[PDB]
Every structure is written in structure tokens, then in C-alpha cells.
Amino acid sequence: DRIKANPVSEKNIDEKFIYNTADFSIELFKNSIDDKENSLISPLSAMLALAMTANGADNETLAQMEKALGKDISIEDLNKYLYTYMKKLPNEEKSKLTIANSIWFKENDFMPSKDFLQIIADYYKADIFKAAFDSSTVSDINNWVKSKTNGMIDKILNKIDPEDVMYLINAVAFDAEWETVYEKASVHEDIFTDVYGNRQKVEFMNSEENLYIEEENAIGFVKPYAKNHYSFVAILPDENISVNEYIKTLTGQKFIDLIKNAKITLVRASLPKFKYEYTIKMNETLESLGMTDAFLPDKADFSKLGKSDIGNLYISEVLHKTFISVDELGTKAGAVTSVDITAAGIPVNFKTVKLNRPFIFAIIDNSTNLPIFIGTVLSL
């Protein structure tokens, strides 16, 4: 409306972005997973929401965020890279991917920096909303994410704290068909009882696949979506190692390369059918990547976002909500990352450790091998 997006230069996607963003993605993953059997993160979604927020950070808060997201990529080069990456990611019938960004800020106690709002509009194509931050803003925001995730996630907020001044929000929506769908005759329902004694029913889908992943600590396959822009990666870690041991061996470059080195050979693949929602408060996960100052009211420097009259601004939470449905016809997947900028108080977080062996999966962009989504199902 007022802030008018200006033309910007592209920065061609290259080995540096691919491998650095791979590094962030896998590290985000291995510090995200917990006791939850079903989990799902979108490193892309969190990347974008956090890249937007980094543009308001200064000094040590900035330096920690640049390092956590881009390693050695400056926020300026990250701005160019992500703009380019959003621009060129394929999106068409049977192979849909959309990405949306928004900034919501308080009309009252907060004056945003004109330069911050501009750089966001320029590189992130963000919707900018000046708001009251009352109950109606809650419905406004949930309307936005419901729309931008195609109904996969209809709510991100339920209430706004009186000392909140800004929400930086990214949404992602993925809707694609398999290149080769499953006939129902390829699907078979097995009944079992879980660890806790509960009857579970999992439908398994059988296919012949032609990309076979073979690491020293894992087996897997890659199944393409129609139009060949995106694939589904499935990884079965070994039993001859600890679950904590396997996660620790995993790296960004290894993940890129293991898909790259997938041998063209026939593989009888079994893919579980699954549909779930997942929520993770990403505070502790991001602190463990070296982003610590942003979450500490006495330390955070977010003075590039703008002027506050209510106190020192800091991130109270990075909320990450996801949804996925893998069935016979394809995959629907949605993600929201909201970053909450507030004046007062202090977050309190608990974190659980993963103890069970997971069936690992990822939805990957075929031209980079970067995981748009990465998650876990089942207890092997």
C-alpha cells in the first residue's frame, strides 16, 4: 500500500547457497526432532521468516542470526539468494508450490523503520499490515494463513500479548501428484499395537522405484512428483547403530550428495500413508544453532525494526506449524513460521529427546536437492 516494492537484482543459486542452506536445514532438523513420533518441519519456511527478522537485527543479535542461517553468507546476500530462490521455484498444475510473507505491526506503541519495511517488501514480496493487535487482528492473521496454506493450516494465533509489536510470518503450500500414482491394489493395511499398547493401522503403499539411496548407515529411495520439479525422499536408518548416533552423523552436504549419488536401479519400495499436523516452538532449537541473543530481553538488539516506547524488543517465540498428507495420488504439505516480537516478559521452554528409530522423509526441490519439508513417521 504505502511501502512500494522496488526492483532488485537476482543472485543466481549456486553451490554456496545450496550447501549452506542444506547445512542449516539438516541442523534445524536434527535439533527439532523430539519424543513426537510424527514430526514435520519446513526449513525453507523458517529460513524465510528468520531471514526477514534478521534484517531488523544489529550487532551481536544480527551476527548470531547471519551465522545461524547462512554460515558465511551475509544477510544482504541472503536477501538476494532467497528472492531469487522464491522467484524460480517451479509452480504449476500437479506440482504446486506457493510462498507468502507478511509483516504485521502495532499501530500504537511501535514505529517501524521505513528502511526495514522497504527491504522486506523488496526481497520478500511481503504483505505489510498496520494493525490494532486486538482480537480482530487474530482473525485477520489466521485468515491470511488459512488462505496462504490453502486451508491446510487455518490458525497460527489465538490471542495477542499486549506487549507484542510485530509478527513476521511465512507460509508455504505444497500440492503435487505422483508421477506414478498408486492403484489401491498396491496398498495393504497392517494392524499392530504400538509401544504403549494402542491399536494402530498403517496403510502401506507398494511401488517399483528407480532411485535407490545407499549410505553406510541408511537405505532409501526417491519417488518423483509429476512434471519432475519435486521428489519425495524416504530414508530408513540402520538398526546396527543408535538412533542418537544416526542423527549426529547427518549433515547438510551429505544429504545433498546422497540424493545426488542415488543409483539408477530398481527398488521395491514401501511408503506409509500418513496425515497429521505438527507444532513446534523453535526457540530452543534456534538457540542450539547459535542464535541466543535474539531470545533474551536483556541482550537482543532489534533496533533496525524500528522504535519502541514499551521496552527492549526481542523474539518471545518462533512458532512453526506444519501439515502433511501422503496418499495414493500425491502429497499435500503446508507450513507456517511466525516470529513474535515483544517488549516484556521471558519465554519458558521444555524440550524432549528423540529415543525411537524413525522412518525419515523429505520433500525436495530437484534442482538443488534442498528439503522444502523434512519430517518423521512411525516407530521402527
CSV table of C-alpha atoms in Angstrom, one decimal:
chain,number,residue,atom,x,y,z
A,1,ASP,CA,0.0,0.0,0.0
A,2,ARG,CA,2.4,2.7,1.3
A,3,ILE,CA,5.6,0.8,1.1
A,4,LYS,CA,6.1,0.1,-2.7
A,5,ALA,CA,8.3,-2.8,-3.6
A,6,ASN,CA,11.3,-1.8,-5.7
A,7,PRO,CA,13.0,-3.9,-8.4
A,8,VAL,CA,16.1,-5.8,-7.1
A,9,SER,CA,18.9,-7.8,-8.7
A,10,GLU,CA,18.9,-11.6,-8.8
A,11,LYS,CA,21.7,-13.7,-7.3
A,12,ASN,CA,22.0,-17.0,-9.2
A,13,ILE,CA,21.5,-20.0,-7.0
A,14,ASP,CA,24.9,-21.7,-6.6
A,15,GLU,CA,26.9,-24.4,-4.6
A,16,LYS,CA,27.3,-22.0,-1.7
A,17,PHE,CA,23.6,-21.3,-1.2
A,18,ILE,CA,22.7,-24.9,-1.8
A,19,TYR,CA,25.2,-26.4,0.6
A,20,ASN,CA,24.9,-23.6,3.3
A,21,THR,CA,21.1,-23.8,3.3
A,22,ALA,CA,21.4,-27.6,3.3
A,23,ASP,CA,23.6,-27.2,6.4
A,24,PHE,CA,21.0,-25.0,8.2
A,25,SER,CA,18.2,-27.4,7.1
A,26,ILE,CA,19.7,-30.6,8.4
A,27,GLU,CA,20.9,-28.8,11.6
A,28,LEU,CA,17.4,-27.3,12.1
A,29,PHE,CA,16.0,-30.8,11.6
A,30,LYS,CA,18.3,-32.7,14.0
A,31,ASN,CA,17.7,-30.1,16.7
A,32,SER,CA,13.9,-30.0,16.0
A,33,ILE,CA,13.1,-33.7,16.5
A,34,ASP,CA,11.8,-34.8,19.8
A,35,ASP,CA,9.7,-37.5,21.6
A,36,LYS,CA,6.9,-37.0,19.0
A,37,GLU,CA,6.6,-39.9,16.6
A,38,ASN,CA,5.0,-37.8,13.9
A,39,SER,CA,7.0,-34.6,13.2
A,40,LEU,CA,7.4,-32.2,10.3
A,41,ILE,CA,9.4,-29.1,9.7
A,42,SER,CA,9.8,-26.8,6.7
A,43,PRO,CA,13.4,-25.4,6.8
A,44,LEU,CA,12.5,-23.1,3.9
A,45,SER,CA,9.6,-21.6,5.8
A,46,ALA,CA,11.6,-21.0,9.0
A,47,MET,CA,14.6,-19.7,6.8
A,48,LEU,CA,12.4,-17.0,5.2
A,49,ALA,CA,10.7,-15.9,8.4
A,50,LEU,CA,14.0,-15.7,10.2
A,51,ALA,CA,15.8,-14.0,7.2
A,52,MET,CA,13.1,-11.3,7.3
A,53,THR,CA,13.7,-10.9,11.1
A,54,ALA,CA,17.5,-10.8,10.8
A,55,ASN,CA,17.1,-7.6,8.7
A,56,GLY,CA,15.9,-5.8,11.9
A,57,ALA,CA,18.7,-7.2,14.0
A,58,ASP,CA,22.0,-5.3,14.6
A,59,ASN,CA,25.4,-6.1,16.2
A,60,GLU,CA,25.6,-9.4,18.0
A,61,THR,CA,22.0,-10.3,17.5
A,62,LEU,CA,22.5,-9.8,13.8
A,63,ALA,CA,25.9,-11.6,13.7
A,64,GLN,CA,24.4,-14.7,15.5
A,65,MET,CA,21.4,-14.8,13.1
A,66,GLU,CA,23.5,-14.4,9.9
A,67,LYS,CA,25.8,-17.3,11.1
A,68,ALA,CA,22.9,-19.5,12.2
A,69,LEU,CA,21.1,-19.1,8.8
A,70,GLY,CA,23.8,-18.6,6.2
A,71,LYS,CA,27.1,-19.6,7.9
A,72,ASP,CA,29.3,-17.1,6.0
A,73,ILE,CA,26.5,-15.6,3.8
A,74,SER,CA,25.8,-12.0,4.8
A,75,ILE,CA,22.1,-11.1,5.3
A,76,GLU,CA,22.4,-8.9,2.2
A,77,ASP,CA,23.5,-11.9,0.0
A,78,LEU,CA,20.9,-14.0,1.8
A,79,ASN,CA,18.2,-11.4,0.8
A,80,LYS,CA,19.3,-11.7,-2.9
A,81,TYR,CA,19.5,-15.5,-2.7
A,82,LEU,CA,16.1,-16.1,-1.2
A,83,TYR,CA,14.4,-13.6,-3.5
A,84,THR,CA,15.9,-15.5,-6.5
A,85,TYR,CA,15.1,-18.9,-4.9
A,86,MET,CA,11.4,-17.9,-4.4
A,87,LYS,CA,11.2,-16.5,-7.9
A,88,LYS,CA,12.5,-19.6,-9.7
A,89,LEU,CA,10.9,-22.5,-7.7
A,90,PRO,CA,8.5,-24.2,-10.1
A,91,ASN,CA,4.8,-23.9,-9.6
A,92,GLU,CA,2.2,-25.4,-12.0
A,93,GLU,CA,-0.7,-27.9,-12.3
A,94,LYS,CA,0.0,-31.2,-10.5
A,95,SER,CA,3.2,-29.6,-9.0
A,96,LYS,CA,2.1,-26.6,-6.9
A,97,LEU,CA,4.4,-24.6,-4.6
A,98,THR,CA,3.5,-21.1,-3.2
A,99,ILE,CA,5.3,-19.0,-0.7
A,100,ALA,CA,3.9,-15.9,1.1
A,101,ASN,CA,5.4,-13.5,3.6
A,102,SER,CA,3.8,-10.9,5.8
A,103,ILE,CA,4.6,-8.3,8.4
A,104,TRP,CA,2.0,-7.3,10.9
A,105,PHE,CA,2.8,-4.4,13.3
A,106,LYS,CA,1.2,-2.4,16.1
A,107,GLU,CA,-0.4,1.0,15.3
A,108,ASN,CA,0.2,2.2,18.9
A,109,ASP,CA,3.4,1.8,20.8
A,110,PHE,CA,5.6,0.9,17.9
A,111,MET,CA,7.0,2.9,15.0
A,112,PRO,CA,8.6,0.6,12.3
A,113,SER,CA,11.7,1.7,10.5
A,114,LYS,CA,10.8,2.7,6.9
A,115,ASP,CA,14.1,1.2,5.7
A,116,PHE,CA,13.3,-2.2,7.3
A,117,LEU,CA,9.8,-2.4,5.8
A,118,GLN,CA,11.2,-1.4,2.4
A,119,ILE,CA,13.9,-4.1,2.3
A,120,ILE,CA,11.3,-6.7,3.2
A,121,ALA,CA,8.9,-5.6,0.5
A,122,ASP,CA,11.8,-5.6,-2.0
A,123,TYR,CA,13.3,-9.0,-1.4
A,124,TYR,CA,10.4,-11.0,0.3
A,125,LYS,CA,7.4,-9.5,-1.5
A,126,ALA,CA,5.7,-9.2,1.8
A,127,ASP,CA,2.2,-8.0,2.6
A,128,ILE,CA,2.5,-5.2,5.1
A,129,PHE,CA,-0.2,-4.7,7.7
A,130,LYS,CA,-0.6,-1.9,10.2
A,131,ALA,CA,-2.9,-3.3,13.0
A,132,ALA,CA,-4.5,-2.7,16.3
A,133,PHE,CA,-3.2,-6.1,17.8
A,134,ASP,CA,-6.6,-7.0,19.3
A,135,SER,CA,-9.0,-9.9,18.8
A,136,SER,CA,-9.8,-8.8,15.2
A,137,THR,CA,-6.1,-8.9,14.3
A,138,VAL,CA,-6.1,-12.5,15.5
A,139,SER,CA,-8.9,-13.3,13.0
A,140,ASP,CA,-7.1,-11.2,10.3
A,141,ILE,CA,-3.9,-13.2,10.8
A,142,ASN,CA,-5.5,-16.6,10.8
A,143,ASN,CA,-7.5,-15.7,7.7
A,144,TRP,CA,-4.2,-14.9,6.0
A,145,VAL,CA,-2.5,-18.2,6.8
A,146,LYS,CA,-5.7,-20.2,6.1
A,147,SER,CA,-5.6,-18.6,2.7
A,148,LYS,CA,-1.8,-18.8,2.1
A,149,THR,CA,-1.7,-22.5,3.1
A,150,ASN,CA,-4.9,-23.4,1.1
A,151,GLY,CA,-6.7,-24.4,4.3
A,152,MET,CA,-4.0,-26.8,5.5
A,153,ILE,CA,-3.3,-24.5,8.5
A,154,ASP,CA,-6.2,-22.2,9.4
A,155,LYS,CA,-4.9,-20.9,12.8
A,156,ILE,CA,-1.5,-19.7,14.0
A,157,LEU,CA,-2.7,-17.4,16.8
A,158,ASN,CA,-5.4,-17.5,19.4
A,159,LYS,CA,-4.5,-14.3,21.3
A,160,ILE,CA,-2.1,-11.3,21.2
A,161,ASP,CA,0.0,-10.2,24.2
A,162,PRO,CA,-0.4,-6.5,25.0
A,163,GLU,CA,3.4,-6.0,24.6
A,164,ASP,CA,3.7,-7.6,21.2
A,165,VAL,CA,4.5,-5.2,18.4
A,166,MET,CA,5.3,-7.3,15.3
A,167,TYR,CA,4.7,-10.7,13.8
A,168,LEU,CA,6.9,-11.8,10.9
A,169,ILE,CA,5.1,-14.7,9.1
A,170,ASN,CA,6.0,-17.0,6.3
A,171,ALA,CA,3.6,-19.5,4.7
A,172,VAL,CA,4.3,-22.4,2.3
A,173,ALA,CA,1.9,-24.6,0.4
A,174,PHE,CA,2.8,-27.7,-1.5
A,175,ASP,CA,0.3,-29.7,-3.6
A,176,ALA,CA,1.6,-32.3,-6.1
A,177,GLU,CA,0.7,-35.5,-7.8
A,178,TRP,CA,2.9,-38.6,-8.0
A,179,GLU,CA,4.5,-39.1,-11.4
A,180,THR,CA,3.1,-42.7,-11.0
A,181,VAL,CA,0.1,-42.9,-8.7
A,182,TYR,CA,-0.6,-46.0,-6.6
A,183,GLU,CA,-3.5,-48.2,-7.6
A,184,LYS,CA,-5.4,-49.3,-4.4
A,185,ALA,CA,-4.3,-52.9,-5.2
A,186,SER,CA,-0.8,-51.8,-4.4
A,187,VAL,CA,-2.0,-50.7,-0.9
A,188,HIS,CA,-2.4,-53.0,2.1
A,189,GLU,CA,-3.4,-52.2,5.7
A,190,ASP,CA,-1.4,-53.8,8.5
A,191,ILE,CA,-2.7,-53.8,12.1
A,192,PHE,CA,-0.3,-53.6,15.0
A,193,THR,CA,-0.1,-52.4,18.6
A,194,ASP,CA,2.2,-49.5,19.4
A,195,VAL,CA,4.7,-49.2,22.3
A,196,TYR,CA,2.0,-48.0,24.7
A,197,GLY,CA,-0.5,-50.8,23.8
A,198,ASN,CA,-2.7,-48.8,21.4
A,199,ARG,CA,-4.1,-50.5,18.3
A,200,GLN,CA,-2.6,-48.7,15.2
A,201,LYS,CA,-3.4,-49.2,11.5
A,202,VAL,CA,-1.0,-48.2,8.8
A,203,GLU,CA,-1.6,-48.5,5.1
A,204,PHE,CA,1.5,-49.3,3.2
A,205,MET,CA,1.9,-48.4,-0.5
A,206,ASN,CA,4.0,-50.5,-2.8
A,207,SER,CA,5.7,-49.3,-5.9
A,208,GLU,CA,8.7,-50.1,-8.1
A,209,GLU,CA,11.1,-47.1,-7.9
A,210,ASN,CA,14.3,-46.4,-9.8
A,211,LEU,CA,16.4,-44.2,-7.5
A,212,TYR,CA,18.0,-46.1,-4.6
A,213,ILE,CA,19.7,-44.3,-1.7
A,214,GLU,CA,22.5,-46.3,-0.1
A,215,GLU,CA,24.6,-44.8,2.7
A,216,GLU,CA,26.7,-46.7,5.3
A,217,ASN,CA,24.2,-46.0,8.0
A,218,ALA,CA,21.0,-46.0,5.8
A,219,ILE,CA,18.9,-47.2,3.0
A,220,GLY,CA,16.3,-45.3,0.9
A,221,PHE,CA,14.6,-44.3,-2.3
A,222,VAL,CA,13.5,-41.2,-4.2
A,223,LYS,CA,10.0,-41.0,-5.8
A,224,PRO,CA,9.3,-38.2,-8.3
A,225,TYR,CA,6.2,-36.0,-8.4
A,226,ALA,CA,4.6,-35.1,-11.8
A,227,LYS,CA,6.4,-32.5,-14.0
A,228,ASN,CA,9.7,-33.6,-12.3
A,229,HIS,CA,10.3,-30.5,-10.2
A,230,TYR,CA,9.9,-32.1,-6.8
A,231,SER,CA,10.6,-35.5,-5.3
A,232,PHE,CA,9.8,-37.4,-2.1
A,233,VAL,CA,12.9,-38.7,-0.3
A,234,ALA,CA,12.5,-41.7,2.0
A,235,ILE,CA,15.3,-42.8,4.4
A,236,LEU,CA,15.4,-45.9,6.5
A,237,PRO,CA,18.3,-45.6,9.1
A,238,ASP,CA,20.1,-48.8,10.2
A,239,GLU,CA,19.3,-50.7,13.4
A,240,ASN,CA,23.0,-51.6,13.8
A,241,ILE,CA,23.6,-48.0,15.2
A,242,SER,CA,21.9,-46.0,17.9
A,243,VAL,CA,19.1,-43.5,17.0
A,244,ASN,CA,21.0,-40.7,18.6
A,245,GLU,CA,24.1,-41.9,16.7
A,246,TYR,CA,22.4,-41.7,13.3
A,247,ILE,CA,21.1,-38.2,13.7
A,248,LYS,CA,24.5,-37.0,14.7
A,249,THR,CA,26.2,-38.5,11.6
A,250,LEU,CA,23.8,-36.5,9.4
A,251,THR,CA,25.0,-33.3,7.6
A,252,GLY,CA,23.8,-30.8,5.0
A,253,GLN,CA,26.4,-31.7,2.3
A,254,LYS,CA,25.9,-35.5,3.0
A,255,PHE,CA,22.1,-35.0,2.5
A,256,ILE,CA,22.6,-33.2,-0.8
A,257,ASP,CA,25.2,-35.8,-2.0
A,258,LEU,CA,23.3,-39.0,-1.0
A,259,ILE,CA,20.4,-38.0,-3.3
A,260,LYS,CA,22.9,-36.9,-6.0
A,261,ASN,CA,24.6,-40.3,-5.8
A,262,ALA,CA,21.3,-42.3,-5.8
A,263,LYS,CA,21.9,-45.2,-8.2
A,264,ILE,CA,19.6,-45.7,-11.1
A,265,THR,CA,18.3,-49.2,-10.1
A,266,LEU,CA,15.0,-51.0,-9.5
A,267,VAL,CA,13.8,-50.9,-5.9
A,268,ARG,CA,10.6,-52.4,-4.3
A,269,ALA,CA,9.6,-49.5,-2.2
A,270,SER,CA,7.1,-49.4,0.7
A,271,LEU,CA,5.7,-46.0,1.6
A,272,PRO,CA,3.5,-45.5,4.6
A,273,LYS,CA,0.3,-43.5,4.1
A,274,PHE,CA,0.1,-40.7,6.7
A,275,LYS,CA,-1.7,-37.5,7.5
A,276,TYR,CA,-1.0,-35.2,10.5
A,277,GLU,CA,-0.5,-31.8,12.0
A,278,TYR,CA,2.6,-30.7,14.0
A,279,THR,CA,3.5,-27.8,16.1
A,280,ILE,CA,7.0,-26.9,17.4
A,281,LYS,CA,8.1,-23.8,19.4
A,282,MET,CA,11.5,-23.3,17.8
A,283,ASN,CA,13.2,-21.2,20.5
A,284,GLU,CA,15.4,-23.9,22.0
A,285,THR,CA,16.2,-25.4,18.5
A,286,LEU,CA,17.5,-22.0,17.2
A,287,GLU,CA,19.5,-21.3,20.4
A,288,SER,CA,21.3,-24.5,19.8
A,289,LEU,CA,22.3,-23.2,16.3
A,290,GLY,CA,24.0,-20.2,18.0
A,291,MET,CA,21.0,-17.8,17.8
A,292,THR,CA,20.9,-16.9,21.5
A,293,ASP,CA,20.7,-13.1,21.9
A,294,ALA,CA,17.5,-12.7,19.9
A,295,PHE,CA,15.6,-14.6,22.6
A,296,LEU,CA,17.0,-12.7,25.6
A,297,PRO,CA,15.2,-9.3,26.5
A,298,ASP,CA,18.3,-8.0,28.2
A,299,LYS,CA,20.6,-8.8,25.2
A,300,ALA,CA,18.6,-8.7,21.9
A,301,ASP,CA,19.2,-5.9,19.5
A,302,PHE,CA,16.3,-5.4,17.1
A,303,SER,CA,16.7,-1.6,16.8
A,304,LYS,CA,16.6,-1.9,13.0
A,305,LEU,CA,13.0,-3.0,13.0
A,306,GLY,CA,12.1,0.5,14.4
A,307,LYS,CA,11.4,2.5,17.6
A,308,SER,CA,9.8,1.1,20.7
A,309,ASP,CA,8.4,3.1,23.7
A,310,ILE,CA,7.5,-0.1,25.6
A,311,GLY,CA,10.9,-1.6,26.3
A,312,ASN,CA,13.7,-3.7,24.7
A,313,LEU,CA,12.3,-5.7,21.8
A,314,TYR,CA,13.1,-9.4,21.5
A,315,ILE,CA,11.7,-12.7,20.0
A,316,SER,CA,9.4,-14.3,22.5
A,317,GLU,CA,8.7,-17.2,20.1
A,318,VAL,CA,9.3,-18.7,16.7
A,319,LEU,CA,6.1,-20.8,16.2
A,320,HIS,CA,6.3,-23.4,13.5
A,321,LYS,CA,3.2,-25.3,12.4
A,322,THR,CA,3.1,-27.9,9.6
A,323,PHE,CA,0.6,-30.3,8.0
A,324,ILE,CA,1.2,-33.2,5.5
A,325,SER,CA,-0.9,-35.8,3.8
A,326,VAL,CA,0.8,-38.6,1.8
A,327,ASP,CA,-1.6,-40.8,0.0
A,328,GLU,CA,-2.0,-42.8,-3.3
A,329,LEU,CA,-2.3,-39.7,-5.5
A,330,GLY,CA,0.4,-37.4,-4.1
A,331,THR,CA,1.3,-35.1,-1.3
A,332,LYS,CA,-0.2,-32.0,0.3
A,333,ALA,CA,2.1,-30.1,2.7
A,334,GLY,CA,1.8,-26.8,4.5
A,335,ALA,CA,3.9,-24.8,6.8
A,336,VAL,CA,3.7,-21.6,8.8
A,337,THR,CA,6.5,-19.8,10.7
A,338,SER,CA,5.6,-16.9,12.8
A,339,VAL,CA,8.2,-14.8,14.6
A,340,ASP,CA,6.9,-12.9,17.6
A,341,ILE,CA,8.5,-9.5,18.5
A,342,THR,CA,7.5,-8.4,22.1
A,343,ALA,CA,8.5,-5.8,24.7
A,344,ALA,CA,8.3,-7.6,28.1
A,345,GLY,CA,8.4,-10.9,29.9
A,346,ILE,CA,10.5,-14.0,29.4
A,347,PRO,CA,9.9,-17.3,27.4
A,348,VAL,CA,10.0,-20.6,29.3
A,349,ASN,CA,10.6,-23.8,27.2
A,350,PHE,CA,10.9,-27.5,27.8
A,351,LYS,CA,12.4,-29.9,25.2
A,352,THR,CA,12.2,-33.7,24.8
A,353,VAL,CA,14.8,-36.1,23.3
A,354,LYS,CA,14.1,-38.5,20.4
A,355,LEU,CA,14.7,-42.1,21.6
A,356,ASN,CA,12.9,-44.2,18.9
A,357,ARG,CA,14.1,-45.1,15.4
A,358,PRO,CA,12.1,-43.0,12.8
A,359,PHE,CA,11.2,-43.5,9.2
A,360,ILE,CA,12.7,-40.3,7.8
A,361,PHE,CA,11.4,-38.4,4.8
A,362,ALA,CA,11.8,-35.1,2.8
A,363,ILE,CA,10.1,-33.3,0.0
A,364,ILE,CA,13.0,-31.9,-2.1
A,365,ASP,CA,13.4,-29.3,-4.8
A,366,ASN,CA,15.0,-31.4,-7.6
A,367,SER,CA,17.2,-28.6,-9.0
A,368,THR,CA,19.0,-28.1,-5.6
A,369,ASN,CA,18.1,-31.3,-3.6
A,370,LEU,CA,17.2,-28.9,-0.8
A,371,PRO,CA,14.4,-30.2,1.5
A,372,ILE,CA,11.3,-28.0,1.4
A,373,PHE,CA,9.9,-30.2,4.1
A,374,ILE,CA,11.7,-32.8,6.3
A,375,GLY,CA,9.9,-35.0,8.9
A,376,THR,CA,9.5,-38.3,10.7
A,377,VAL,CA,6.8,-41.0,10.9
A,378,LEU,CA,6.4,-44.4,12.6
A,379,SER,CA,8.4,-46.1,15.3
A,380,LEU,CA,10.6,-48.7,13.7
